[PDB]
PDB file of C-alpha atoms in Angstrom:
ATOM      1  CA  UNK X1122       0.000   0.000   0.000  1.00 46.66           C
ATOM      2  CA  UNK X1123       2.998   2.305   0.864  1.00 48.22           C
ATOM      3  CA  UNK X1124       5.320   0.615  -1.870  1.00 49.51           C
ATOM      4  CA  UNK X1125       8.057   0.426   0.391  1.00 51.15           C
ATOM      5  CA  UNK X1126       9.433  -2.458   2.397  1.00 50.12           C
ATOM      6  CA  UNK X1127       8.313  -3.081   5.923  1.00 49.05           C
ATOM      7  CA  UNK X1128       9.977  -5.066   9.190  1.00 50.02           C
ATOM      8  CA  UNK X1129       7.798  -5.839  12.199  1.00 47.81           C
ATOM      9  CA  UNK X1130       9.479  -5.781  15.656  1.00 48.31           C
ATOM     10  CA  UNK X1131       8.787  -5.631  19.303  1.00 45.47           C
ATOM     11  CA  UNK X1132       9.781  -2.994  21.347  1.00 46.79           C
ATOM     12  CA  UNK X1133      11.967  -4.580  23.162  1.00 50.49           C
ATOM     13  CA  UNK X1134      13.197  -6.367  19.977  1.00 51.20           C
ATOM     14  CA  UNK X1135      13.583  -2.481  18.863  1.00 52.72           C
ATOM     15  CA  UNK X1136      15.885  -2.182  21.495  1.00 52.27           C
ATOM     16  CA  UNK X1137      18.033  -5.226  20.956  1.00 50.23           C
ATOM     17  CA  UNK X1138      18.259  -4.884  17.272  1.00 45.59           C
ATOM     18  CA  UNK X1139      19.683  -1.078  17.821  1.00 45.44           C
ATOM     19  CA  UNK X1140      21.781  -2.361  20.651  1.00 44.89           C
ATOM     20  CA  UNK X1141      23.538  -5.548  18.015  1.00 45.52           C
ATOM     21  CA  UNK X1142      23.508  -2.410  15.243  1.00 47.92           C
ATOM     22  CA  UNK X1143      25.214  -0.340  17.551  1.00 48.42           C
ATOM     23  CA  UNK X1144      27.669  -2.885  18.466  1.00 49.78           C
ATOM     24  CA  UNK X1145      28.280  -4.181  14.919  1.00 47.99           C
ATOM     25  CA  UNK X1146      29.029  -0.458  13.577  1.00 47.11           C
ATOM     26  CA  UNK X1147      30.836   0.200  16.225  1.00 49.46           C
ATOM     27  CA  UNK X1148      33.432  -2.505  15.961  1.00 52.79           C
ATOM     28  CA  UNK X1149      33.641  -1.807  11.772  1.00 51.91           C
ATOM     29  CA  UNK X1150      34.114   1.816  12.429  1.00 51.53           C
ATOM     30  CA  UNK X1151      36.714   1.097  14.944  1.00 53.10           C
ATOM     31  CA  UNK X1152      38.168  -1.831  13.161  1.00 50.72           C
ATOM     32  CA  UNK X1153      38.508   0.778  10.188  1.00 54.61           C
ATOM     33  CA  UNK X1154      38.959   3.800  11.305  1.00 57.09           C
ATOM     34  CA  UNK X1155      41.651   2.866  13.826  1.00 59.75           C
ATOM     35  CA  UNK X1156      40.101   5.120  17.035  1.00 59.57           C
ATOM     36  CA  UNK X1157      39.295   4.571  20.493  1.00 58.55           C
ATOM     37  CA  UNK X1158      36.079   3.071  21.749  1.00 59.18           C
ATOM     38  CA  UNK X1159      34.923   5.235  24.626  1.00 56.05           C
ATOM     39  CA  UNK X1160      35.043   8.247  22.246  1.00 56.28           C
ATOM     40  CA  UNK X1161      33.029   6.095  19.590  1.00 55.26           C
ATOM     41  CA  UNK X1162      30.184   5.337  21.939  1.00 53.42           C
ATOM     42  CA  UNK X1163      29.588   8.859  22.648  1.00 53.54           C
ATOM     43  CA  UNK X1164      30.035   9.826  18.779  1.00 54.60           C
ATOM     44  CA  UNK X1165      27.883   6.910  17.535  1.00 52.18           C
ATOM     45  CA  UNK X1166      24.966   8.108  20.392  1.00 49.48           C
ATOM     46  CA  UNK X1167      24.048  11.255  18.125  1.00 50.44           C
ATOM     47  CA  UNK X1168      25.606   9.695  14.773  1.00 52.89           C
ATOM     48  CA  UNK X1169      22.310   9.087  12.458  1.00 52.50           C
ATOM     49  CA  UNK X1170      22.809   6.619  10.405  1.00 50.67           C
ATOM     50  CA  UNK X1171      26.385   5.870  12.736  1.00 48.92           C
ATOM     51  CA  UNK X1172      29.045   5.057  10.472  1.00 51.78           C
ATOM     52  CA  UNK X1173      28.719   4.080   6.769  1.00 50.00           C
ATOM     53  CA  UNK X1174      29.376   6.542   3.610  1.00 49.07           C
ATOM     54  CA  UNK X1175      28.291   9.738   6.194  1.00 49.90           C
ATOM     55  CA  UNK X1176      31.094  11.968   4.751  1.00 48.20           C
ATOM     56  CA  UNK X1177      28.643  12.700   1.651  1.00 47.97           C
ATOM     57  CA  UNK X1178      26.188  14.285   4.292  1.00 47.96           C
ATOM     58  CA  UNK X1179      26.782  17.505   6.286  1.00 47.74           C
ATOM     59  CA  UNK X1180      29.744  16.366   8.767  1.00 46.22           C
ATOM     60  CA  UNK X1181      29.499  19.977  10.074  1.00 48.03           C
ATOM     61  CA  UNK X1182      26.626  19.478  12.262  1.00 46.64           C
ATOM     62  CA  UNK X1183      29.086  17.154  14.054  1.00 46.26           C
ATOM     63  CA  UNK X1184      30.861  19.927  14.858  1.00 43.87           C
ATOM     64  CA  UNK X1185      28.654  21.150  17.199  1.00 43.28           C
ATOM     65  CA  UNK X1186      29.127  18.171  19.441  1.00 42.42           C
ATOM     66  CA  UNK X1187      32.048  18.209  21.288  1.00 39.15           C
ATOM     67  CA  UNK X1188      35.267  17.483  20.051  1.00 38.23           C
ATOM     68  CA  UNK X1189      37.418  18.023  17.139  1.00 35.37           C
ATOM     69  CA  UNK X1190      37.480  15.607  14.046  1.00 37.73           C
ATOM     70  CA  UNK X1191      39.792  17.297  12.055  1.00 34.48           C
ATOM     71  CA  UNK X1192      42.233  14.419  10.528  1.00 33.06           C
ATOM     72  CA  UNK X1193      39.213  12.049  10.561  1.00 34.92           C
ATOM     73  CA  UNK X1194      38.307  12.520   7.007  1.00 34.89           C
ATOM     74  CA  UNK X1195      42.075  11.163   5.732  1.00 35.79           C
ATOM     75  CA  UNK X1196      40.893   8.169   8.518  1.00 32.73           C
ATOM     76  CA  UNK X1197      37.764   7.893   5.510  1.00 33.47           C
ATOM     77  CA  UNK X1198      40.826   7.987   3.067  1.00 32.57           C
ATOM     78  CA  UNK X1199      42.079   4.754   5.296  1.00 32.82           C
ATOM     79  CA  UNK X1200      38.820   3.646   4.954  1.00 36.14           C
ATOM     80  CA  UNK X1201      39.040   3.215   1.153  1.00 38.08           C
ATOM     81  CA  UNK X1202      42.584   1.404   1.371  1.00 39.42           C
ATOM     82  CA  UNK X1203      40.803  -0.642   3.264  1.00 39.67           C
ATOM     83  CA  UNK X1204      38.308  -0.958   1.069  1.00 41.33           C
ATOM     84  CA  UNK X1205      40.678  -2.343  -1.375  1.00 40.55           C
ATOM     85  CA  UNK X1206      41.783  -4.664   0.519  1.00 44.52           C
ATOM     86  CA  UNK X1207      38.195  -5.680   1.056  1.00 46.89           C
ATOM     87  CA  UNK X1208      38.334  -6.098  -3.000  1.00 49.01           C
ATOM     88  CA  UNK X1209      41.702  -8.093  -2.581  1.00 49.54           C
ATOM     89  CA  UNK X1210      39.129 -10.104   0.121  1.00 48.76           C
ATOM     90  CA  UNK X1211      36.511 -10.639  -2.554  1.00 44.86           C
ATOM     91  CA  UNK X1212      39.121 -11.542  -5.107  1.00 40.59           C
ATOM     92  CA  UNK X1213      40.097 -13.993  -2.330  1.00 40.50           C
ATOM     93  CA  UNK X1214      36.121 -14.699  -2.215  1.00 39.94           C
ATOM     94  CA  UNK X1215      36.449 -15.296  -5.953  1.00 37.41           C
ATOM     95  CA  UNK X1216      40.090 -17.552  -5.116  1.00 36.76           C
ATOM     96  CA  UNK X1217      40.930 -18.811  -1.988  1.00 39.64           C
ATOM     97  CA  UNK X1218      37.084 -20.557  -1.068  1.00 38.99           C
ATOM     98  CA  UNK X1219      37.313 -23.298  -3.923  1.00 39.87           C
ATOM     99  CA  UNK X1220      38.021 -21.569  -6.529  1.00 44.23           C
ATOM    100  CA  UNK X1221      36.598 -23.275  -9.948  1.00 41.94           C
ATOM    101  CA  UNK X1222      38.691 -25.077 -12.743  1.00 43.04           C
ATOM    102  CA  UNK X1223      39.178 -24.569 -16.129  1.00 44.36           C
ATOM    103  CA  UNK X1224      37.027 -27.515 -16.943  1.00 41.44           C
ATOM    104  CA  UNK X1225      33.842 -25.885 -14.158  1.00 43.67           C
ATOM    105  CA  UNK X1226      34.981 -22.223 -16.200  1.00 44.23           C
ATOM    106  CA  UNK X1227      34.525 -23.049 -19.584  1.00 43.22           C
ATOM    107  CA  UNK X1228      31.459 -25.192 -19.379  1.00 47.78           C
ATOM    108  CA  UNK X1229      28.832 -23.705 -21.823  1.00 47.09           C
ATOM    109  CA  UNK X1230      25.810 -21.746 -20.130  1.00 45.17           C
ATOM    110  CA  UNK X1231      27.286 -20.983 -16.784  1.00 45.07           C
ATOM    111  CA  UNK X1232      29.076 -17.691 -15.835  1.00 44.40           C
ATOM    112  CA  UNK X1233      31.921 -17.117 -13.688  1.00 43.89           C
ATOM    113  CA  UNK X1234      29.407 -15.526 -11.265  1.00 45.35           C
ATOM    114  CA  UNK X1235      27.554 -18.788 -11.426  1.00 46.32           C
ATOM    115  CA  UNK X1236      30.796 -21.074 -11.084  1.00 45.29           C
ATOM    116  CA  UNK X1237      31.440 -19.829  -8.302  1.00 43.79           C
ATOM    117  CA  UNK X1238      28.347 -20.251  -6.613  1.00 44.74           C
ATOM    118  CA  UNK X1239      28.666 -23.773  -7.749  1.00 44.50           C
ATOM    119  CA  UNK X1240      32.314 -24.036  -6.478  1.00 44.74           C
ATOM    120  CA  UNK X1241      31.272 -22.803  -3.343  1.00 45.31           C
ATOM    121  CA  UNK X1242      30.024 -25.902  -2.256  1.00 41.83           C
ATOM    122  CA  UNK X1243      33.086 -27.699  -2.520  1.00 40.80           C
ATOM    123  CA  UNK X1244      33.209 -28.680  -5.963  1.00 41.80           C
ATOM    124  CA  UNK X1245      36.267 -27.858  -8.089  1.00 39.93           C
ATOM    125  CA  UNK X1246      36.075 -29.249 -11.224  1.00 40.28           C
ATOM    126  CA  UNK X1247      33.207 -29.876 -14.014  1.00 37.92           C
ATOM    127  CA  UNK X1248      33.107 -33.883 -12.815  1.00 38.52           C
ATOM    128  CA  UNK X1249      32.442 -32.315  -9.203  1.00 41.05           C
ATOM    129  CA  UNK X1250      29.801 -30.754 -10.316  1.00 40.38           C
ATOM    130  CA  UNK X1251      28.232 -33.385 -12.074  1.00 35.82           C
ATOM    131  CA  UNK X1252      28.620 -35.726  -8.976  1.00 34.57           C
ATOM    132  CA  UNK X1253      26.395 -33.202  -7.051  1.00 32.69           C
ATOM    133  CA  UNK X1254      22.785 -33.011  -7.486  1.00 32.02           C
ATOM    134  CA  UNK X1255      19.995 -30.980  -7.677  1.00 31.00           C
ATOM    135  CA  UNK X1256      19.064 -30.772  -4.337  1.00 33.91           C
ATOM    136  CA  UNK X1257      22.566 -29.987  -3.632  1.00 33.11           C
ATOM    137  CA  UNK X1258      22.390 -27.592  -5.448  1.00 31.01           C
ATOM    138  CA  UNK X1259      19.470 -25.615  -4.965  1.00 29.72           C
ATOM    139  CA  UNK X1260      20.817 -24.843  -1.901  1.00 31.73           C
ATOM    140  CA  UNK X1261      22.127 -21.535  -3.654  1.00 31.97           C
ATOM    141  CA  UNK X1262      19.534 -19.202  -4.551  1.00 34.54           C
ATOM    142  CA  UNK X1263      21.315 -17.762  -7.223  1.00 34.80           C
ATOM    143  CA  UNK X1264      20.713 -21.584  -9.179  1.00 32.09           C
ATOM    144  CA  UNK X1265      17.282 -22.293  -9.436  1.00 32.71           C
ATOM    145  CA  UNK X1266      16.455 -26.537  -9.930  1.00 31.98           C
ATOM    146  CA  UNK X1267      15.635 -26.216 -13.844  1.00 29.47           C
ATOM    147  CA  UNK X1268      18.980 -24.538 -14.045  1.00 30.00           C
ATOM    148  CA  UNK X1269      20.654 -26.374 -11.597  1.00 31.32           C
ATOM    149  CA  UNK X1270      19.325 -29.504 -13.435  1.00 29.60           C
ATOM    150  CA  UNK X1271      20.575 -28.464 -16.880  1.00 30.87           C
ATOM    151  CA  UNK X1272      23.738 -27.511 -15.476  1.00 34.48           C
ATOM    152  CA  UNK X1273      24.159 -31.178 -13.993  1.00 37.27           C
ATOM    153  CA  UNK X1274      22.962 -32.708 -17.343  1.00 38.13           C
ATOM    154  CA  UNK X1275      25.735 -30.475 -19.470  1.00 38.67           C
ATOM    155  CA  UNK X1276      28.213 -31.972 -16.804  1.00 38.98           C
ATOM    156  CA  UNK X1277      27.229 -35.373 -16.932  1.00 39.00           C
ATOM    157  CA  UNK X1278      27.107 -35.225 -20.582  1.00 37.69           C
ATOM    158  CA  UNK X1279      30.836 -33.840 -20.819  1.00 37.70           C
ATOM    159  CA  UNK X1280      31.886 -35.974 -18.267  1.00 40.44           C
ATOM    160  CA  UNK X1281      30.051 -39.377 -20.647  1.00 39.01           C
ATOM    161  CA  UNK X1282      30.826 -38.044 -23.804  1.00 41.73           C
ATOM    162  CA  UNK X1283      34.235 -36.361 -23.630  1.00 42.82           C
ATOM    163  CA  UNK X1284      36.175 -39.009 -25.612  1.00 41.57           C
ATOM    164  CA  UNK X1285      34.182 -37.529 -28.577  1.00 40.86           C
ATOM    165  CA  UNK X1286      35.017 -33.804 -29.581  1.00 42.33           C
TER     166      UNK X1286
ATOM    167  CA  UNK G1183       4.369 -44.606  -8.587  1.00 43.97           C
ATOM    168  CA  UNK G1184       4.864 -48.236  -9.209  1.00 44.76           C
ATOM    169  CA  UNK G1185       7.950 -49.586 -10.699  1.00 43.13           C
ATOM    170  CA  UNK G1186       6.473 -51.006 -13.481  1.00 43.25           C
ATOM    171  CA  UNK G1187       6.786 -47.348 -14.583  1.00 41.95           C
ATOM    172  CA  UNK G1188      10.353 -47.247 -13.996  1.00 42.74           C
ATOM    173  CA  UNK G1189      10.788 -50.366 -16.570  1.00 41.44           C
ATOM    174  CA  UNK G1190       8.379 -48.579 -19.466  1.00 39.28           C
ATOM    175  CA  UNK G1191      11.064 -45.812 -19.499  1.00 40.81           C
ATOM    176  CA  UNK G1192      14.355 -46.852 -20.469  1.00 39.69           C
ATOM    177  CA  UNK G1193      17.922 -46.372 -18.084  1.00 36.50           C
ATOM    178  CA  UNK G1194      19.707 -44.372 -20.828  1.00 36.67           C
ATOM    179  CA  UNK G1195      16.257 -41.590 -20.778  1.00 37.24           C
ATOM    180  CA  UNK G1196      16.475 -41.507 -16.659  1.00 33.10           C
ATOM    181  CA  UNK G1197      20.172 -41.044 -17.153  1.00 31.06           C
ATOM    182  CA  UNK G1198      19.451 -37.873 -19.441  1.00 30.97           C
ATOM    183  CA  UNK G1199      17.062 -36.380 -16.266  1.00 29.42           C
ATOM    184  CA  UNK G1200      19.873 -34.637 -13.573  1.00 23.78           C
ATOM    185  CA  UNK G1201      16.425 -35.378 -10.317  1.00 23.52           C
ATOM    186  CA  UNK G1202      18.553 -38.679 -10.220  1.00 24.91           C
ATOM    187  CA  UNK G1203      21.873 -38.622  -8.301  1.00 24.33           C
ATOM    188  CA  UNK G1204      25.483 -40.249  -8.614  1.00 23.28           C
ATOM    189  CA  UNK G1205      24.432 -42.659  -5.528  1.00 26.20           C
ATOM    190  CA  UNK G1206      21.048 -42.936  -6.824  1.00 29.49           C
ATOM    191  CA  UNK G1207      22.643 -44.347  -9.995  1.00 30.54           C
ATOM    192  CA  UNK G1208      24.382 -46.998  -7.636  1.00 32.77           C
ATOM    193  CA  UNK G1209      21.011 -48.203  -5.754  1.00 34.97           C
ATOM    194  CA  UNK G1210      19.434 -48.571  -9.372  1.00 29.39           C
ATOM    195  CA  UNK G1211      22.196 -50.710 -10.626  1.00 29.93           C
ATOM    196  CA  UNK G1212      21.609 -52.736  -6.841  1.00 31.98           C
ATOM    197  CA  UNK G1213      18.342 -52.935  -7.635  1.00 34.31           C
ATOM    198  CA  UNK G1214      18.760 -53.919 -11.471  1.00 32.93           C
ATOM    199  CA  UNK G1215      20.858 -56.868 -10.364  1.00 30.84           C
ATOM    200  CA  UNK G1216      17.968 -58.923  -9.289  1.00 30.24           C
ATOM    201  CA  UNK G1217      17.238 -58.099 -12.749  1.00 33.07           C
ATOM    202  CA  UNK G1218      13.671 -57.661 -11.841  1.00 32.12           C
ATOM    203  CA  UNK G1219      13.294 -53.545 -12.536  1.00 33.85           C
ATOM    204  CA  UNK G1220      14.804 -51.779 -15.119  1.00 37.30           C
ATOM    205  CA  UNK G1221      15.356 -54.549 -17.634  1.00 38.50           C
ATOM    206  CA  UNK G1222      14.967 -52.638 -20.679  1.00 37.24           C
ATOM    207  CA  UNK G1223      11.061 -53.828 -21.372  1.00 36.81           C
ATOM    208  CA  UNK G1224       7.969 -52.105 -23.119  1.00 39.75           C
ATOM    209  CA  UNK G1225       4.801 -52.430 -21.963  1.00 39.84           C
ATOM    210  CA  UNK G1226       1.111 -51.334 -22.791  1.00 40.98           C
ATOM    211  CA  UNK G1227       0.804 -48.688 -20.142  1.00 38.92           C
ATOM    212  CA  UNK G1228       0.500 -50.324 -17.393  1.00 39.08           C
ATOM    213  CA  UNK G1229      -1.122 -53.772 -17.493  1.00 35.65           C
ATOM    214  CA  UNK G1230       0.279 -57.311 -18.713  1.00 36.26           C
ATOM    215  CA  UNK G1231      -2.072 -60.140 -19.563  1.00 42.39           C
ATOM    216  CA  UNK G1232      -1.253 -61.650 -15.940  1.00 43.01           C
ATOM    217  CA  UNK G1233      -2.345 -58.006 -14.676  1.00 43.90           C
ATOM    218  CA  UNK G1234      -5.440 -58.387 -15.801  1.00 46.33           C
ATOM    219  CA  UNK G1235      -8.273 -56.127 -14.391  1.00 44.02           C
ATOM    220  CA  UNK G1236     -10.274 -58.933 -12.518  1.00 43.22           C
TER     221      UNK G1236
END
């Protein structure tokens, strides 16, 4: 009716899900902003919307609570290095968790995207994935069981008929 | 259903579905030993002259 999405708490739930936000933000802003955590508390108990991509928004109304936060925005700058290394992490999400082979890669209608949603599971190669089924599969959401089935099917069949070109 | 079904479709056209599995393949070829199911056969659609209606 509104066209926007909706979440139904308690109040009390209210309170707990700002207290595990509060605690979560406050360890990622201090994990990558490199400050204390007594000073964060305080900072994060006015902060609206407490610590993700805020620079874009008035930080000078910030400067009427107490304090200074003068070198803070080069600490953003940090943030972004960071950042890349979060990108070196996702390359390592791409990588280092099972990373698919050149057999799983090349196999016709499947992505790398999709490969390594299929890899995920443990499979490496295009025989891996043709041991696993459809119910295995369709534990990913990204694979639906018609496509997870025809995936299966394409493996089998290059896995059966790969003495033929 | 019945298994009669599974022997009016041949191995080679369940092998082309990917709803069986690598271990399912196994417990068909253990139960294709007693050479009872999955023997290759044709039938009407259901019924044999022995499975008659009465």
């Amino acid at each position: 009716l509104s066209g926007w999405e909706l979440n139904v708490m308690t109040v009390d739930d209210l309170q707990a899900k700002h207290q595990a936000e509060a605690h979560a933000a406050i360890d990622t802003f201090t994990k990558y902003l490199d400050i204390d955590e007594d000073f964060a508390t305080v900072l994060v108990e006015e902060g609206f919307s407490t610590l993700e991509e805020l620079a874009y928004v008035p930080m000078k109304e910030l400067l009427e609570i107490e304090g200074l936060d003068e070198p803070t925005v080069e600490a953003l700058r940090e943030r972004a290095k960071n950042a890349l290394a979060t990108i070196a992490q996702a390359q390592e999400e791409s990588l280092g968790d099972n990373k698919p082979a050149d057999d799983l890669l090349n196999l016709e209608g499947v992505d790398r995207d999709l490969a390594f949603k299929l890899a995920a599971r443990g499979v490496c190669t295009l025989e891996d994935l043709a041991e696993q089924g459809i119910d295995d599969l369709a534990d990913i959401e990204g694979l639906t069981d018609e496509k997870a089935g025809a995936l299966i099917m394409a493996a089998r069949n290059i896995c059966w008929f790969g003495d033929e070109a | 259903h019945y298994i009669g079904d599974l022997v009016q479709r041949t191995e080679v056209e369940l092998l082309k579905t990917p709803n069986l599995g690598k271990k399912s393949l196994t417990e068909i070829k253990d139960v294709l030993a007693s050479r009872g199911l999955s023997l290759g056969m044709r039938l009407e659609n259901w019924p044999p002259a022995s499975i008659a209606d009465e």
